[PDB]
Design an enzyme around this catalytic site. Structure first.
Site, mmCIF file in Angstrom:
data_model
loop_
_atom_site.group_PDB
_atom_site.id
_atom_site.type_symbol
_atom_site.label_atom_id
_atom_site.label_comp_id
_atom_site.label_asym_id
_atom_site.label_seq_id
_atom_site.Cartn_x
_atom_site.Cartn_y
_atom_site.Cartn_z
ATOM 1 N N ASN B 205 -8.545 -8.403 32.969
ATOM 2 C CA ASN B 205 -7.535 -10.065 32.773
ATOM 3 C C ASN B 205 -7.766 -11.236 33.815
ATOM 4 O O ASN B 205 -7.070 -11.961 33.441
ATOM 5 C CB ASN B 205 -6.298 -10.026 32.209
ATOM 6 N N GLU B 250 -28.994 3.065 22.281
ATOM 7 C CA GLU B 250 -29.882 1.960 23.223
ATOM 8 C C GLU B 250 -28.682 1.960 24.225
ATOM 9 O O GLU B 250 -29.412 1.960 25.394
ATOM 10 C CB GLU B 250 -30.640 1.255 22.668
HETATM 11 C C1 LIG Z 1 -30.414 5.692 37.114
HETATM 12 O O1 LIG Z 1 -30.634 4.454 35.840
HETATM 13 C C2 LIG Z 1 -31.174 4.180 35.870
HETATM 14 C C3 LIG Z 1 -32.411 3.715 36.271
HETATM 15 C C4 LIG Z 1 -33.364 3.408 35.255
HETATM 16 C C5 LIG Z 1 -33.005 3.541 33.924
HETATM 17 C C6 LIG Z 1 -34.046 3.512 32.420
HETATM 18 C C7 LIG Z 1 -33.659 2.889 31.481
HETATM 19 N N1 LIG Z 1 -33.278 4.383 30.791
HETATM 20 C C8 LIG Z 1 -34.724 5.030 30.786
HETATM 21 O O2 LIG Z 1 -35.535 5.145 30.617
HETATM 22 C C9 LIG Z 1 -33.709 6.562 30.362
HETATM 23 C C10 LIG Z 1 -34.458 7.100 28.738
HETATM 24 C C11 LIG Z 1 -34.217 8.609 28.604
HETATM 25 C C12 LIG Z 1 -33.759 8.523 27.076
HETATM 26 C C13 LIG Z 1 -32.966 9.942 26.361
HETATM 27 C C14 LIG Z 1 -32.814 10.856 27.313
HETATM 28 C C15 LIG Z 1 -33.796 9.621 24.753
HETATM 29 O O3 LIG Z 1 -33.081 10.664 24.474
HETATM 30 C C16 LIG Z 1 -32.667 10.588 23.639
HETATM 31 C C17 LIG Z 1 -33.260 9.743 22.377
HETATM 32 C C18 LIG Z 1 -33.508 8.636 22.139
HETATM 33 C C19 LIG Z 1 -33.668 8.407 20.324
HETATM 34 C C20 LIG Z 1 -33.439 9.221 19.723
HETATM 35 C C21 LIG Z 1 -32.653 10.489 20.488
HETATM 36 C C22 LIG Z 1 -32.546 10.382 21.264
HETATM 37 O O4 LIG Z 1 -34.017 7.636 26.586
HETATM 38 C C23 LIG Z 1 -35.151 7.053 25.874
HETATM 39 O O5 LIG Z 1 -35.924 7.329 26.376
HETATM 40 C C24 LIG Z 1 -34.726 5.369 25.122
HETATM 41 C C25 LIG Z 1 -34.560 5.357 24.047
HETATM 42 C C26 LIG Z 1 -34.227 5.021 22.745
HETATM 43 C C27 LIG Z 1 -34.240 4.136 22.676
HETATM 44 C C28 LIG Z 1 -34.934 4.724 21.429
HETATM 45 O O6 LIG Z 1 -35.527 4.833 25.713
HETATM 46 C C29 LIG Z 1 -35.923 3.982 26.742
HETATM 47 O O7 LIG Z 1 -34.832 4.433 27.812
HETATM 48 C C30 LIG Z 1 -36.157 2.627 26.788
HETATM 49 C C31 LIG Z 1 -35.261 1.560 25.916
HETATM 50 C C32 LIG Z 1 -37.473 2.257 26.516
HETATM 51 C C33 LIG Z 1 -36.289 2.020 28.454
HETATM 52 N N2 LIG Z 1 -35.389 2.849 28.954
HETATM 53 C C34 LIG Z 1 -35.141 2.125 30.629
HETATM 54 O O8 LIG Z 1 -36.158 2.047 31.193
HETATM 55 C C35 LIG Z 1 -31.724 3.601 33.853
HETATM 56 C C36 LIG Z 1 -30.628 4.545 34.529
HETATM 57 CL CL1 LIG Z 1 -29.435 5.401 34.088
HETATM 58 N N1 LIG Z 2 -6.541 -10.673 27.521
HETATM 59 C C1 LIG Z 2 -5.747 -9.891 26.761
HETATM 60 N N2 LIG Z 2 -4.821 -8.530 27.043
HETATM 61 C C2 LIG Z 2 -3.518 -8.457 26.680
HETATM 62 C C3 LIG Z 2 -3.590 -9.231 25.434
HETATM 63 N N3 LIG Z 2 -2.179 -8.353 24.465
HETATM 64 C C4 LIG Z 2 -2.091 -7.915 25.634
HETATM 65 N N4 LIG Z 2 -2.870 -7.416 26.347
HETATM 66 C C5 LIG Z 2 -2.416 -6.623 27.409
HETATM 67 O O1 LIG Z 2 -2.214 -5.888 27.550
HETATM 68 C C6 LIG Z 2 -1.178 -4.865 28.609
HETATM 69 C C7 LIG Z 2 0.285 -4.632 28.259
HETATM 70 O O2 LIG Z 2 0.329 -3.603 27.128
HETATM 71 P P1 LIG Z 2 0.904 -4.204 25.824
HETATM 72 O O3 LIG Z 2 2.045 -5.948 26.109
HETATM 73 O O4 LIG Z 2 1.874 -3.479 25.516
HETATM 74 O O5 LIG Z 2 0.187 -4.171 24.568
HETATM 75 P P2 LIG Z 2 -0.515 -3.320 23.910
HETATM 76 O O6 LIG Z 2 -1.932 -2.531 25.344
HETATM 77 O O7 LIG Z 2 -1.485 -3.651 22.842
HETATM 78 O O8 LIG Z 2 0.182 -1.997 23.459
HETATM 79 P P3 LIG Z 2 1.289 -1.717 22.478
HETATM 80 O O9 LIG Z 2 2.210 -3.112 22.881
HETATM 81 O O10 LIG Z 2 1.910 -1.089 22.635
HETATM 82 O O11 LIG Z 2 0.304 -2.077 21.267
HETATM 83 C C8 LIG Z 2 -1.155 -6.262 29.397
HETATM 84 O O12 LIG Z 2 -1.361 -5.904 31.053
HETATM 85 C C9 LIG Z 2 -2.241 -7.394 28.699
HETATM 86 O O13 LIG Z 2 -3.400 -7.311 29.985
HETATM 87 C C10 LIG Z 2 -4.425 -10.539 24.978
HETATM 88 O O14 LIG Z 2 -3.824 -10.638 23.984
HETATM 89 N N5 LIG Z 2 -5.440 -10.881 25.513
#
Ligand SMILES: COc1ccc(C[C@@H]2NC(=O)/C=C/C[C@@H]([C@H](C)[C@H]3O[C@@H]3c3ccccc3)OC(=O)[C@H](CC(C)C)OC(=O)C(C)(C)CNC2=O)cc1Cl
Ligand SMILES: Nc1nc2c(ncn2[C@@H]2O[C@H](COP(=O)(O)OP(=O)(O)OP(=O)(O)O)[C@@H](O)[C@H]2O)c(=O)[nH]1
Ligand SMILES: Nc1nc2c(ncn2[C@@H]2O[C@H](COP(=O)(O)OP(=O)(O)O)[C@@H](O)[C@H]2O)c(=O)[nH]1
Lengths: 425, 428
Positions: B205, B250
């Site tokens: 915040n 995704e």
């Molecule tokens: C190190 O930092 C990074 C640098 C670059 C990037 C690039 C970034 N992530 C990857 O390649 C990661 C691939 C791992 C597999 C994983 C292992 C699949 O088993 C997962 C799966 C998918 C579907 C169903 C069941 C299981 O996901 C994919 O293939 C997904 C398929 C989904 C969207 C349909 O497709 C893509 O990723 C896109 C949307 C086409 C392009 N994505 C990217 O450019 C990411 C990071 Cl974190």
């Molecule tokens: N941005 C934003 N932060 C909120 C709001 N209400 C509570 N907070 C956050 O809540 C934190 C304090 O927690 P609480 O006041 O106890 O409210 P809570 O997180 O919902 O916890 P409970 O009251 O026990 O339900 C503060 O640091 C705020 O940042 C809100 O309406 N907007």
């Protein structure tokens, strides 16, 4: 004639297979209705390896298109060769794996492998004799690499006396944006080492380099890569599709080109590569063994050709081809192993591919392919030392020792490649 | 074909969820009573808002929302000032607050009410056939929003282990804080919900207050409206046509590489008082003073970027803005295929509250980017935790509810491991 059952897994396999089948049916003179319309009797000869003879002069391919998404099947059916393919051989899943090798190797590939085994057994039990299985898939994808390796394991269990030819597409960072592709590539390489006897290592990095330097096209569009791999696959399979001195009918190609059960990684290439022009013998031969022309990211100056099967297509003088290739072999005797004598086999086919007057296709088990398995393994090392996306694969039941086993097997393959490169006669 | 069940815990969660569902009814053109003028001609679902909104037999578009709080004041405020929009069966109230105590909401007061909330969650999930997961709205500082959130995350990880759960937390700020033990609650609910949360959009915040001060003290209503606008444009892609980030998988795969590092950062350019080119508003998304977390990304390394554009933004100049961003040497990506700004553009303009706090604008941009700069915020939180644990200050309010003394040392060890893992990611 013998019979080959064609298998395509993944959308990359489906797209390249559709383009390849279109190039073949253009070359063999087969129309969209499956009837012969060519002008040469050699086109109808040796047609039973690829095209099944249906009723009323219908030559449909024995292609098994396998995927996990129906959009690829709809794209296949929407093309020109869609009605040409067998509608009963379509197999498609509901949900794709999406670059997940474990999901396509342990759950969804396992849940569809019984159906694809039933289709394979239905095709195989009608065979008078089985020649082998040709597989075309990509090593980077989710259902492609995983379901391809599961199909390879099931085929090797069911038919241990049959060859397994794989057009494995190694993924590259220059055309693919997914980051987890070294995991799928290294796992599929470890499966293909232990359960496959042939591998056509077509690399998308070298395809992008060819389209950038040779064709001068900055954008690596998938249509141009599809056309290039389809042309190279047609030039490779012109030995199987046409009778000649070098038949190389799968088992003969494995006997000629493969000296060891682990070192069976080829390196196809295509010399007159032109996008969508005088052609002669010595320019084609000097373009045949060039580093830039080859479709794998390798340096042939750093390695030794264990076996070479250079095939020429078109109307050329065979004596000039033999003289030029003998001059090439003698001028570059340091580039070939001296403990395998007469390792260059030349065949000449009179039918060129359509659109080209002459063609020149080379297959080779060069030692320079270990640079590719060093590059993919070192990209795998930078993705396994920090465990990126490891929770996806290890949550599907895969152990984390599986990645270590695959890395150790690829490092052992690299060590054996270097050890047999260092030995001389 | 897909459903999402929103969960709001705490007063902050309930107020943020009410503002967000008001903005969702405003943006989608849904009437406040529940009917729809245009899209109710079909009368069925799967009309790109079925991920959030459910249709009853009478045609009312009741949201799939669960409002849980241990104080019934805000629940009755939603039920009075909306009433026919939200069903009273899904709005769960409580009797006694946890009163800024994690252990009270986690062991004694929340444990007497967790079963009814689980039964209501299962009852709402029975209407969902293809549900993806849950959106947890809570706050780090409170007692309900930490303890009941942690117990809910534990129960949903035990019972719904095949689903992915998001997180929408509120990072505590010294400008508006109602308690002193917000470091204790925040560290304890971070350690408990580390393994049960997959994407945590923790927004403090202090940044919202500074944005309201320098662009628009501002009260909790202006902060609530701005935070509702931020979250609505974060989840605009999930309720609209499909370009990217339309699913929880995704979200989990485009930004979260690690099982523990799931803290993205949001940044918003167009905050104006109630024109601007695409290049400058893309540049303002990289300004450290406009981020939703008060931290400096230039000392850290990026991991991902998912730029989401709203309004009539031409996609030709977005790539030129990307090139002008990438020419600067400020952004230092990671070195294992870092990719880049995965821009997806939604052509529907965002709708602002009529006579509210933000003016209607035509170009809007949000930068869902992962970085290692959140480790500074966690270092600040652990420094405040370490200052109040050298002399065991405020310890007895937690041990009296069954919590052990070793839980604080365990949470300190977990936060030290998180800081060490952030450093190991930050070191090549
Ligand atoms: C190190 O930092 C990074 C640098 C670059 C990037 C690039 C970034 N992530 C990857 O390649 C990661 C691939 C791992 C597999 C994983 C292992 C699949 O088993 C997962 C799966 C998918 C579907 C169903 C069941 C299981 O996901 C994919 O293939 C997904 C398929 C989904 C969207 C349909 O497709 C893509 O990723 C896109 C949307 C086409 C392009 N994505 C990217 O450019 C990411 C990071 Cl974190
Ligand atoms: N941005 C934003 N932060 C909120 C709001 N209400 C509570 N907070 C956050 O809540 C934190 C304090 O927690 P609480 O006041 O106890 O409210 P809570 O997180 O919902 O916890 P409970 O009251 O026990 O339900 C503060 O640091 C705020 O940042 C809100 O309406 N907007
Ligand atoms: N050469 C080439 N490679 C492709 C093509 N389409 C996809 N690929 C490669 O295949 C990989 C993706 O595999 P894919 O077939 O999409 O797997 P799937 O989604 O699980 O079916 C990527 O790494 C691409 O490099 C293509 O048309 N040509």
């Amino acid at each position: 004639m013998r019979e080959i059952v064609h298998l395509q897994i993944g959308q990359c396999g489906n797209q390249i297979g559709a383009k390849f089948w279109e190039v073949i049916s253009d070359e063999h003179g087969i129309d969209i209705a499956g009837n012969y319309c060519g002008n040469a009797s050699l086109q109808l000869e040796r047609i039973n390896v690829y095209f099944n003879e249906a009723y009323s002069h219908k030559y449909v391919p024995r292609s098994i298109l396998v995927d996990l998404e129906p959009g690829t099947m709809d794209s296949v059916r929407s093309s020109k060769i869609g009605p040409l393919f067998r509608p009963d051989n379509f197999i498609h899943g509901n949900s794709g794996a999406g670059n997940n090798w474990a999901k396509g190797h342990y759950t969804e590939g396992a849940e569809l492998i019984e159906n694809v085994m039933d289709v394979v057994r239905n095709e195989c039990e009608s065979c008078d004799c089985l020649q082998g299985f040709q597989l075309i898939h990509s090593l980077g994808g989710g259902t492609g690499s995983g379901m391809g390796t599961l199909l390879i394991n099931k085929i090797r269990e069911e038919y241990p006396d049959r060859i397994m030819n794989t057009f494995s597409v190694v993924p590259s960072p220059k055309v693919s944006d997914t980051v987890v592709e070294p995991y799928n590539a290294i796992l599929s390489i470890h499966q293909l080492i232990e359960n496959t006897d042939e591998t056509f290592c077509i690399d998308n990095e070298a395809l992008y380099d060819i389209c950038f330097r040779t064709l001068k096209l900055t954008n690596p569009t998938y249509g141009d890569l599809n056309h290039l791999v389809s042309l190279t696959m047609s030039g490779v399979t012109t030995s199987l599709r046409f009778p000649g001195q070098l038949n190389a009918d799968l088992r003969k190609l494995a006997v000629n080109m493969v000296p060891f059960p682990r070192l069976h990684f080829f390196m196809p290439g295509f010399a007159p590569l032109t996008a969508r022009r005088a052609l002669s013998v010595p320019e084609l031969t000097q373009q045949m063994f060039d580093a830039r022309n080859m479709m794998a990211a390798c340096d042939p100056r750093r390695g030794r050709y264990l076996t070479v099967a250079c095939i020429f297509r078109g109307r050329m003088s065979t004596r000039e081809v033999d003289e030029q290739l003998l001059s090439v072999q003698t001028k570059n005797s340091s580039y070939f192993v001296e403990w395998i004598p007469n390792n260059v086999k030349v065949a000449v086919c009179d039918i060129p591919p359509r659109g080209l007057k002459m063609a020149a296709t080379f297959i080779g088990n060069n030692t320079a392919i270990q640079e590719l398995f060093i590059r993919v393994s070192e990209q795998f090392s930078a993705m396994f030392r920090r465990k990126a996306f490891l929770h996806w694969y290890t949550g599907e039941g895969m152990d984390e020792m599986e990645f270590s086993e695959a890395e150790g097997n690829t490092n052992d393959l690299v060590s054996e490649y270097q050890q047999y490169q260092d030995a001389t006669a | 074909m897909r459903e999402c069940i929103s969960i709001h815990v705490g007063q902050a969660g309930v107020q943020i969820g009410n503002a967000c569902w008001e903005l969702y009814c405003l943006e989608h053109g849904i009437q406040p009573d529940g009917q729809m003028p245009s899209d109710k001609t079909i009368g069925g679902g799967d009309d790109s808002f079925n991920t959030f909104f459910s249709e009853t037999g009478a045609g009312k578009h009741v949201p799939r929302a669960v409002f849980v709080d241990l104080e019934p004041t805000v629940i009755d405020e939603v039920r009075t000032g909306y009433r026919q929009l939200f069903h009273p069966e899904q709005l769960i109230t409580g009797k006694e607050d946890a009163a800024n105590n994690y252990a009270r909401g986690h062991y004694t007061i929340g444990k007497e009410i967790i079963d009814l909330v689980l039964d209501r969650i299962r009852k709402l999930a029975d209407q969902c056939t293809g549900l993806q997961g849950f959106l947890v709205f809570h706050s780090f500082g409170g007692g309900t929003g930490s303890g009941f959130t942690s117990l809910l995350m534990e129960r949903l990880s035990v019972d719904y282990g095949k689903k992915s759960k998001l997180e929408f937390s509120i990072y505590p700020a010294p400008q508006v804080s109602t308690a002193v033990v917000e470091p204790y609650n925040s560290i304890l609910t971070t350690h408990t919900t580390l393994e049960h949360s997959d994407c945590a959009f923790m927004v403090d915040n202090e940044a919202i207050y500074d944005i309201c001060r320098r662009n628009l003290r501002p009260t909790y209503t202006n902060l609530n409206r701005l935070i509702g606008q931020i979250v609505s444009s974060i989840t605009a892609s999930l309720r609209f046509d499909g370009a990217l980030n339309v699913d929880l998988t995704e979200f989990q795969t485009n930004l979260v590489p690690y099982p523990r590092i799931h803290f993205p950062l949001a940044t918003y350019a167009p905050v104006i008082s109630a024109q601007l080119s695409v290049a400058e508003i893309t540049n303002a998304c990289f300004e450290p003073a406009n981020q939703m977390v008060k931290c400096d990304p230039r000392h850290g390394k990026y991991m991902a970027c998912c730029l989401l554009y709203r309004g009539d933004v031409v996609p030709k100049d977005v790539n030129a803005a990307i090139a002008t961003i990438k020419t600067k040497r400020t952004i230092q990506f990671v070195d294992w295929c870092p990719t880049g700004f995965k821009v997806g553009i939604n052509y529907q303009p965002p709708t602002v509250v009529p006579g509210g706090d933000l003016a209607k604008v035509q170009r809007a941009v949000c930068m869902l980017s992962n970085t290692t700069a959140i480790a500074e915020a966690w270092a600040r939180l652990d420094h405040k935790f370490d200052l109040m644990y050298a002399k065991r200050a405020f310890v007895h309010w937690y041990v009296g509810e069954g919590m052990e003394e070793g839980e604080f040392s365990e949470a300190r060890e977990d936060m030290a491991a998180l800081e060490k893992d952030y450093e190991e990611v930050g070191v090549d």
